Structures are given as C-alpha cells and as structure tokens.
Amino acid sequence: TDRPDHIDSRVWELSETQEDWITQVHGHVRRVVECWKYTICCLISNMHTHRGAPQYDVFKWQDRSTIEWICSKKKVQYPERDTPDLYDNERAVAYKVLLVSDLSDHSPTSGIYHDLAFNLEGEAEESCALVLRGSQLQDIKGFLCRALEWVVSNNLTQEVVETISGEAKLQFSVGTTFRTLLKRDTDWDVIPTPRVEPNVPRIEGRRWTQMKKLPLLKEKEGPPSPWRALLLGADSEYIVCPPGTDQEAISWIHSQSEIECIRESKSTPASVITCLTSSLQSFAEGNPVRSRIHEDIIAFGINKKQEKKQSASSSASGEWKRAEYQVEEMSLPPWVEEEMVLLRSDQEDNWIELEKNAIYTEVDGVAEGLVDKYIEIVGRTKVASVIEKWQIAATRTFSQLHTDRSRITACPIITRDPSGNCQFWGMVLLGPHHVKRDTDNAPLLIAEIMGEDTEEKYPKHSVFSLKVEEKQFLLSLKITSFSRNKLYTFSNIRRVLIQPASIYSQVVLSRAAENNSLNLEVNPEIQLYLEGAQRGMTLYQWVRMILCLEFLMAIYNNPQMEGFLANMRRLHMSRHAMMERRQVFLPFGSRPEDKVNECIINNPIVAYLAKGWNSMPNVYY
Amino acid sequence: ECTLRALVEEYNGACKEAPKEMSKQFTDYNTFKRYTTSKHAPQMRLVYSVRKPWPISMTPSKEIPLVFNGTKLKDTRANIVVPDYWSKYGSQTSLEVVNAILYAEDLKVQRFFSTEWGEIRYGRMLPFRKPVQACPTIEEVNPASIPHTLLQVFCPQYTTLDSKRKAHMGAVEKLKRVMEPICKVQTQESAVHIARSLIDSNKKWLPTVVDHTPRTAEMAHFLCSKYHYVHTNIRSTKFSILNSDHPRIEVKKVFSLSPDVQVTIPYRRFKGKAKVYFQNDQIQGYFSCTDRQIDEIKISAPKNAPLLEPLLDICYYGSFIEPGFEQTFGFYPAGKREFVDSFFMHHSKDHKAFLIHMGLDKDLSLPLSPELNWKEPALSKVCRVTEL
C-alpha cells in the first residue's frame, strides 16, 4: 500500500482521507483509479485561463462549502452524490471524467453534465476529443500510458476493470495471524458450524411444590443489639436558650453549666470532657477552631493506625492464613418498641416548616391541601423533631468537612423555635480529618442531651450530669468515625417523609375515588395484624407509626437491611396472594426464607421486622 | 471587519501552539470535542462552595468593590452578593432585548394560562403510558429533517442541495422570523438549542387515559392520574379528476416475506386515459394520465422554484414509477405507513426513476429541468412538459 510512481505525492496525500479505502473490495486500486481521474482533471485544467479567470474549475476532492460558493456565483446548483468533476466556464458546461474499458458504449449518464470517456490505453471518445484541445489529449494519453504500464507491471488489469465496472463493495477481512490468536481458547472456528442435527432433548425435571404455609423466619439468639447510630434518636432532648445567635447560646450554656460524670464507659473515656469544654469556650469567643490538646489522642484516634500496627507487629506470632471475618450475631433489643412508642409522642411545635408552593389551578389546591394535612398529621411528633435534629447535625458536620484541616472544629446542633429561643439538641465535634475519599471515616465526638440513661442500650456512650438554671439534664458523649457519603445522605434525611405521605395520599385518593367527592378529612379504619388479633387503628396513627418505622429503617440502613427488604418483597407479595385466596407454587429447591434468613445477623430493626413477620397468621386457609 | 482579523489571529495562534492537534482529521472533532479528564456529581460540593469567601468567578468589568461595606471584588473573583447587586443599582437594557432573550418560555407560560380547566373528577381510571409528542411545535416536522431545517435556518450558505431537499420548508421561514432577534442577543449554541426545542418532535412516554393532543401532552403530569382526571377545553397538495374513462381501481399487492406472514398494501391507479388538475400552493396545472404512464404535463409555477415534491405527489397518485409500488425497497414492509414514508424519502433522495419513466430530450425549449426545477438553464431538459 505505497504511492504509485506515476501519481504525485500531493495527489496521494489529498486522496488519503476522502473515502474508506481499507474497508472496500479491491482497495488500493479504486483509490488509484480515483487518483487517475483527479490527475486527468488537473491536466485538463493545467494553467488554462479565460476572461482573466481559470477556464476550468475542478470540483473533485474539494470542500463542499467552497464548491457551493463557486456554484452559486455561476447560477447553478449540484447534488452531493452526482456532482461534476469540473466545469467549463468558456462554454458554460460541466464535465465529469469517466474511465471506461470500451469506447463503443459511450452511454451518456445524465443530461446534467456531459461525460468524458477515456480508455486504459489513451484514446478518448470522439465527443470529448473534439471538445478539448490536442495538447490536453496528448498529456492524458501519456499519463494513461504510464498508468497502464504500471498496471501491467503489477498485473492488476482484471482488478482495474472490475473497479471500473463496479461502484463500491464493502468488505471486512480478518488476517491469518489474528485467526490463530482468536481460536486459541475455543473448539470452533471463526464461523461456527457444529456437526450436530438440531433438536431439543426431552429432559426429566422435578415437580413444583405448593407453598401451603408462609415461611417462618429464624430469630437469632445472642446479646441484645446496642444502639449504633450517629445520634440518640428518640431519647434526644433539647435545652431552651434565650433568643440569639448560636454563639450567644453556646456562651450562655458554657457560663451556666456543671459537668459531673454519672456513668463511665471504657469505649469513651471520661477524660474527653476537657476537650468538649474547651470547644464550648472556643466557640463562645467566636472561633470554632482549636489547637490540639493532650486529651485528644485518645479522643479522635490520633496516630491510632500506626499505634495499632506496631502493637500487632510486636507479637507477630502464628502462620499466614486466609483472613476470616466473623460478624457477631445479636438478638432483638427490647428498646425497639420503646423507641417506636416514644417517636410517636405528641409535641407542641409543628417541627415541619416548609414553604407552601403557589396555587394557580384547582389541581394545585388539592395537592397543597393534602400536603398541609399530612404535615399536620406527622408534624407535632417527636420523630419530626428527631428528623430535624438529624438534618441540622448532618448538614453542619458536612459543611465543615470539605477541607483538610488538622485542627478541631466545632459544629453545635442548635435549632430555633418560632418564638426565637435557641434549642441545644447537642453538639458534633470534628477532629483532624485528612480525608481523601468519600468512603473515608472522619473522627467525631458526639455530645448530646439524653432523656433517660440505659447502660444496655448505650454501652459506649458516657453520661455526664449537666446542670443549667435549676434544671438538670443528662449529656451523652461518644467517639464515632463517620464517612462523607453517610453525612451527605443524612443531610437530606427529610426525604423520609415521602413514603408515609404516599401511603396517606393513596388512601385518601382511593376514598375520594370510590365515590365522586374530595373530603380531605377522611379517617378510615385500617385493620392490621397487631399482636395476632385483627385490631385496626386510625389512618392518622398508622401514618404516624409508618414514619417512625421508616426513620428507624433509614438511620439503621446497611447491607443486611437492603438484602432483608429486597428478599422479603417477594414474601410480602406471596402473603398478599394468599390473602386474595390464591395458590402459590414453588420449584424444586425453593427456599425463599433462606434468602431472608441470611440477612438477619445483628441489625435491630431487621430483627424487629422479622418478629413482626413472625407475629402474623401463618396459614390463611 | 475586525472579527475576521480576530479569527485569523486565533487560527494562527492555534496552529503555532498546537501543531499535532491541528494535524488531526476534521472528522475527529466528534471525538475530541468531549476531551476532558474530569470524572458523584458536584451536588455535594455546593453548600460549601457557595459559602466560600469568593465563589463568583467574574470577568473584569465596572463593579463597585465596596458598597455599604461590601467587599465584593478581590481582583477575577467576586462575592456571592454581586448577583443580587445586579438586580438593583445596576444597568438596564432595551425592552426589545428582554422581550427577545426568552421566547420559547413565554410561549410555554402563555399556553398554560390560556386553557379553561374543567371540574376535577375522581374515579378508578387506570392510565397506560403511551408515546406522544412532548410539547407543541410551531410546525409539523419529522424527527429526521430537524438537523437539516436547523442548518437551513442558521447556515443557509454552508449546506448541500440534498440537505435543502430533506428539510421542511415553511417552518424555516417562521423560525427565521422568530429567531432573528434571539440569535443577535444570545449565543449560537443557545440559539440552536432554542430552535430545536421549538421544532423538535420528541415522542416521550406520558400517562394516557384519553387521547392526548400535543397541547395536552405538554401539561399531563396533573391532568390525569390513577385517581383523578380534570378535563381541558397526499401531504399538502390536492387533486381533482376532470375526465376519467373508468373509475379508480383498488387493486392490492401482497408481499410474502415467509409462507406464514403476509402484508396487504393497496396501491391506487387509474386505467385508460385520465386528466387530473393538481394544485399545491403556487404550483398549479393539469396533466394527462395513462394506465400507468404519463402523456403530457402542464405546470404553472414561479420561476426558479423547486418542483420535486409535487411530481413525487403525482407519481404516487397513479402508481406510475415502478420501484416503489411493485418492486419492494429491498426489505419487507411491515405496514403501509412506513411504506408511504420510505417511498417519499428514497425517491426524494434520488429521482432517477422519474427521469427514466419520462425520458430526456436534447433540446433546451422544454421548461422543466432534470433537477426538477422550473425554468432554469441546463445542458438538457426533461421532455413532455409544458406550461399553461
């Protein structure tokens, strides 16, 4: 695939990127034919001028924009696929060169442009010979003679006449060396052709078994699961403060505070109260950044990686073996129901203040009324306050966890009531975080207000007595490392309101659709399988419990929870089917409860949902 | 014009600075246009970015750095408050500029506040999603000629005759009228985006309880749902027979891709002799008809007018040209619709069949040209066509 001697380097370089030569049949020959035609056009238009402008304007292998510009000035327009090769300005005609094997079959292609016929040996058709000058014919005959001697030197004459007869043939050929590489790891060729007669064998399979009864999940036995979450959830109280900014409230709390330890946990040493008090003071002055102190190495895990590596390498006793990780199995904690009841408790404020969207149509009024009533239902609840606390804490922690600071940062958890009083829900304490990925864990020191102390529920939280203005509240303190993605997704924890809103909306809309009337204060009876018996609560209480359960499911989301829910969707569908007096059949090795039981290890709400499943009628008959 | 000087200077700078990249092929533009090492989403780094001391990256201009202890310029970088300062105590523009800067949005808002919504009713109606045109368009344009229409609107001089042929006329003129101010005020890319959004027919799956008109489909997320529904308020040419010896037949041809599957696509043709007066906008005239051939055509058209689509309308009327009514297009037609469209696309891309059917004459007195244009100079003219 090299340049022919009779073709100039400029012509070859121009012709390189004009068409896909490599993927066409008889490549490197069609390109040579096109180069022949272009060279013929150039020789015909060789330094010839007329009326002060070149007589012949070649169009082959030229930009379409400038071709259209030239044609527009000449009061003629040409199509893309049938454009002439050159135009004769002297007599206002267009000519396209066409190499042919025989000159007898002139065959005028079209009336748009007269053609020019040339054979492979040099002689031209009578029309194109008598329309052009003798020097042009002599030059073309010489060029064709050199082309023909080149062709017969490399004996492509049949190939040349095939390209002349044809127009284009797409192809794609795989070489012989690539074929050997391709067929190294297969029993067939590039074109498979097994010597087997097509047929579908008759295989004897097993039989399908009916799900006579719904499966029973396997409750796990072990120590009760502690409360493993960023914040305290339902046990979260707040301290009222005079109206003002965060700094004023923090200064007031620091001025009026007496901290004494009630319960000390080995996980969180009681000595980390000094750094928290220092952070209170520093935020009171105004700068929520402090230099590192002595009581911070055991508080934010400074140099723990190197220390633990040295401790592990100190012994270095044993033999290399595959790393086996064991996940401890835990039972259902007693406090899940306590949290569910407390999260449903009624508060005084609304705790859900969202700006009402505008109303322009009748449909907008219905949606806004439904949203307002839903917010009224689930607003004056403890769970809404806990959601607001979680949102504020996560956002304040995330906003200060974007740089690579090596100093302690303070992010108080302060909310403001409609009156204006500050509300101290707790405080997040950033540590030195040289974060590099969203999955990296940044040290935190969560200090928050309890409402009740339970050692079994909080084995790691240290409880300190806090006295503020003749009122005493507890104070939690836990060391926690928490990642960027988790903080980001908890900064939008208000999204959890959607699912109970969807349930309430569908109930109300179904009630309004049974008849033809919108009521907006429908409170139907929702029959549920509570404690085995079929007792039904109200819609308002059901949505309230649904929100609390979803909030617990959100802050306690993990791969176990995801697998549990994903594999129990089908069991819920089967339960609905059996409720509708329907038969459920299963294949041979069908153990749907196995896919669920493997996801129940130590997650509290997973175990609670498992018990709720195993608190239901088994056979629906 | 200094713009040409700037273009030349920038081209020289690009050639000198980036020799290897400039030596790439022009078709590689579709590859290196999106060349970037940027790798989720910046939604995470927004609350911190907005609260940075100098979030706004402004250009050197006449902005007060300190107003009422503002500190809004560091010299560039700007404070987050300077977008708000440009809403009061700033510089204003002409009413034509503000009217033309947004046009499609004004149309969408105007349509919304122009419909008399009925009374919302609730029931057990179940919606089924169907593909309907997303938003109303200024003209009915197929999803294949939109790029060519845009090329004709924005760059008429950089185009090809084929692109003009496969472009919806009429919509181009209205688009030019509505976008002459918009192109002047906004950027070229934004202008192209507004133009396509005006003319694009993007079929999008939407809820459907009743047949959605293009107007209704735009606002459908609230009109219908699972529990409620509120109730709202040949091509262009025509033909007329004058003298038909026998009436038009309804013969149909069946295509057998396999012995088990067949399709029945009927083609309508005359018999004997006929004369039909075809009318299409400025084009008017009557042509003699044969059993399947054409004897004479009389056309009254404006000078230098495109006369391709009217003749394609004529060919379909009598099933005159063979390769689109008996001989398939190389593939089995699934239905009559795409057969109707594919005929008018294949025979508009190339019109060799018409020229072969009617033939070519060597004289220049015949008005119509092989390129299907009225009264233009040419090296040859199609025969058996005259004027009234």
Added chain:
Amino acid sequence: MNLFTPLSEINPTTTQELLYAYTGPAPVAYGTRTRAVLENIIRPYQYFYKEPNVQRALDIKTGCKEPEDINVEGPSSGFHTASVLKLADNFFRKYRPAMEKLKYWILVKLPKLKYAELSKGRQTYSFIHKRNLPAPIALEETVEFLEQNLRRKIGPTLLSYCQAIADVMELDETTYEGTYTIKFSREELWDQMRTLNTMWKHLERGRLNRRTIATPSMLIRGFVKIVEDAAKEILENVPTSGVPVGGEEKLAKLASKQTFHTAVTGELSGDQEKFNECLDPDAMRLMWTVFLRKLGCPDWIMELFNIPFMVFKSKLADMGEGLVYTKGKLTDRKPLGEMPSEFDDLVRNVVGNSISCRLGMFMGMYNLTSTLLALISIEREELTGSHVESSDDFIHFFNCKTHEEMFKQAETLRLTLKLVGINMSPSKCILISPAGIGEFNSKFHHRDFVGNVATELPALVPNGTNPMTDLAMGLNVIKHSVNTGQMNLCTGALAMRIFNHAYKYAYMALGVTRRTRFMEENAITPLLTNQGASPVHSFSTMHLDEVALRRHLGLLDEETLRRILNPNNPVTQIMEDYSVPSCFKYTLSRHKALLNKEERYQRVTSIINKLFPEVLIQEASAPGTVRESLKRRLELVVERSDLDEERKKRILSRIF
C-alpha cells in the same frame, strides 16, 4: 412488619414501596476485589458438572455439554449445542418481521456507524498508561497508536476502526512513540486486548454481598458496540423483550388482557440465579451465526459478529490487589498462588496479575445479547405463554386449560432456560396460579394496575451548576417521577416543597446569613426563589421557567426584569430547556501531560466552533484534516465578506 400489611382500605401491594430503603446510606464496597472476582470465576467451573470437578473442568474450551450432564437440581453452567441450533431456528422462523429490521440495520445503518460514538462510554483501561482513563482519552490514544503503527489514517466509520484493530494484530512489533517509546509485541498486545479491568460496583442497593463489574478495552469496544447495537435492533421489535425502548408497555398490556374463564391462568415472576457466571459466549456466537446465516448475510458479516465473543472466550480478568492474609492482628495482601487459599485449582490460569477463564461471562458486559440467548429458549411448541425478560428478570403468563398442563409448561420453561445456562433461581421464582399478582423489574402488578416503584429515591438535592439551571433540573426530575406513576399529587407537591427548601438553604437564602443581611440594609428586595422570596412554581407548573412565570404573574416587574436579563452583565459576559442566560446564570469557582493536550484540544475546538456553525447541529463529517478545513473555511469567509479586494488579499496574506 405488621404495619406494612394493611387488611382494609388499601392493598398490601399498594404499601410495597414501604419495603424500600430510599433514605439512608447505600452500601459501599471496602478493600480488595480479588476475593469477589475469584468467587465469580470459580462458579462457571463448579456448576459445569453435576458434581464439583473444577480440576478436570479447567480443560473445556467450549461449554457444550450433553443433556444427561445438565444439573436439573442446582445451577448448571454450559449449553447444549443442538438445542441452541433448534432454538435459534425457531426464534428466527417466528418473529420474522423483527429480523428484516436487523437486515436493514446491517445493510444500511451498520456501515454508517462512526467510531466517535465510542467516546460516549464509561472509563476505559488504557494499555499505554495502565490506568483507568475517560473514554475520549483512551479512544484518542488508541487511534494515535493505530495510526503510528499501521502508517495510515483511520476512517471515520466504526467498520474502519474494526478493520484497523484487526490489521494491527498482524504486526509482530508495535510502538507508541510520542519522550515515550513504549514497545509491545503481538502477544503483549493480544493480552492487553483480552484484559478486562475489574472494579467494585459502588453504591449498589438491594444486595447483601458486594459484586464487581468490568469494562472492555478500547481494542474490543468497537466490536462490542457493533454486536450490542445489533442486539438492540433485534430486541426493540420483539414482544418478549423487556427493553426500556418498549417502555415496559408489554407488561401493562399483559396485565390488562382478559382470559377465558374456564382457562387456568398463572403468572411466574422470578430472578435468574448466577446469570453472568453460567452463560458461555460460544452459545451467543452460535446463535448469531445462525441468525446471520438464515438471513443470507455475507460471510464477512458473520466473521465480524464473532470477534467480540471469541476475544471474550480468552478473557484475562484482572484479579485486583490480592487476597488478605493474617498472622495475628496484622493484615497483608498477597497475590493468588503465593499462599494456599480456597482457590488453588486456578493457580495454573495466572498471567501476571490477571486470571484466564474460558467458561462464564462477567458482570458489566454483553447485557443486550444475554437477553437474546434467554429468549430463543422460549420459542418451543410446548410453551404457549407470554414471556417478558430483561437481563436477570423475567415474567411468564401461563394460559393453560388444566393445572397439570400448567405445571408441565412451567417445568418446560425451567428446563429450556437450562439448555443454554440461564439457570432461573429456585428461591426467587414464585408462581401465582389463579390470576396475576407479580413483579417485573421495579414494577409491581396487581389485577389491572401496574405501578412503578422507585429503586433509588429521586435526589431532591440542589445540583452544582447554578440556581437558575438547578431549579430546572430539580423540577424536571420531580415531573419525570410523577409522569412514571411513582409519585402523585400530594407526594409530588411534598417533594417540590422539600426540594425548594433545600434549594433555598444551599444558596444562603434561608435563615440569617451574610447574603440575607446584605439584602437588608441595601434594600435589595428578594424577587427570585434563590433570593429567599416566596415560591412561584406550583405542582401544575413544573414545566415553565421561573423568570417567564414571574413576568407573566407580575413579580419581576420590568425595571428589575431589564436589569437581571442584561446581556452585558459582568457575571456572564433529560436536556435542560430552561434557564435563559441572566445575572443568576453564573458559574462557580473550582499524567500531567494530558492537561496540556486538554488545553490544546480546547483551543482547536474553540476555533472550529466559530468558523463551523454546522457542527453545532450535525456531527462533523468532512474529508481532510483540521488544518486544511480551517484554512479553506477562513478563505471562504474572507471572500464571502463585503470588503474590497485589497483587504481580502492582505488578510489572506496574513494567514499562515
């Protein structure tokens, strides 16, 4: 869970979305991926035989097996060749109209495919830098490598790209000169072409155990793209495909259709167990060969449709970083075969830091053509039901007249998918006999109602472009969620309110911060949503822009309207068809040898963008190079100008 199963006024399937984990962190994968990929590679060999015989199983080139060797109890890896021939023949004779579309695509659309579309993909492993790179960089590196080695200029079409890839493998020695003189041999280039770069599938929900994915190298991406567009063209026209192009309307029609009362209905909905570690590429090669041979396609088409799978039969999966080994409390990662482990049968198939695997597919590749292999098995005389399958998820509607025939067809359906290795999951497939209650993809079906249930919650969080555009994307996402049936009136309005509140917060328009106090003593009245003003968008008004709505409602008046839409403003100067350029349409403020190339290509793109208005509308297509194209366009625009001849000629003189 007793709260999620109501007994009155609402169906349990209606409360199915409560069984989701929209809020809360999604699971993320930690540490090395070697263990996961090794357990993914062992499965095709463990299930090949009825009893585990991996040591002998590591000698099979083609997964063809005998009917008596198919494990009817547990998973079975492999296929039956004659079964594949007969099933492909049946799937071609039936649905024949859908096969002429493939013929039209091959004869017309296939040669017109451009290799520039390969840049609109995922991150690609580059055999130059041995590092994951964005698709455009990998594509341009591969193109430059081919041009340097083949000594020719690659055509714009994808077929030319594949021809160049085929030709470069014929050269014994290859180089990538360009400071750098990286040298490759035929074997090294072949291994780089075969190598798949494996990575964790991060942020995946609904699974307890993490799983890995791999992406093809640029040397085979063109072939894979060709076969995948062919598979898509076939799947877009068959009623048995759960392709998103069909919109899952097929499930809606199958749910709404009636049935003769005496006929016994039934609906099987389930998952496929180990879908991507049971299928053998040779089955797809054979099916494609049958499809293109019964269509009368040319021989070169049939050849071209087998490189993508024959390279995959020789895949060299990247193990990763190694397996974790511990002495005491210290952890060290070691490569496979360095120490005894639970994978010692595969130490032979180790090529550096890669593992070879003839049998089995891998996640992240051949998604569309896997569906075709799962749909040819349906076309049998016994099976008279309606199948809708999308990757490892199917649904079958039985319409028998007797229960015994129902179970016979159910077992026939179970067995026919095992003839090619689909291996439906026994523990995940559930059949409901009386009528239709089931799930497909994320949809849930009950009687005549099929409702979409989201897998991941719509992110009601502001983006990072600018408030004017950010509101547009937020409202568009909410509108899309409502339009798919996942949301409704109240849920949609609540989502809008939550998004609006977060959007106001994220631009310092809420509470008492620097911005709002800056607007206090300066008398800057808030007129936009991002300024903390009252919201203007309603539930029925997600599809209109903010500024036009406020102008129509008389909120931005005209003095402020003129000032905020000034084109000469200092700040400025699911497609987003909103956010007219205004004052608030601003932008924020944010191996090294690739950066300079980035500015070089940016300059080339900028100069092209100005002289070529047509590249904004249609893809660039013009013979020649960038330099010549720009030079000729500059000459044309100079001559097209209205200036006199002397100015034009001196401008052309300045061009150099």
Added chain:
RNA sequence: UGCU
C-alpha cells in the same frame, strides 16, 4: 458561626 442561624434550614424547624
């Protein structure tokens, strides 16, 4: 250093 101020999202109910």
Added chain:
RNA sequence: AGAGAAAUCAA
C-alpha cells in the same frame, strides 16, 4: 479507642 462488615478507614 471507635467506625464498621466478609475489609478497609483511623493519613
């Protein structure tokens, strides 16, 4: 310490 879950973060 702790976070956590089949293995990493605590530079």
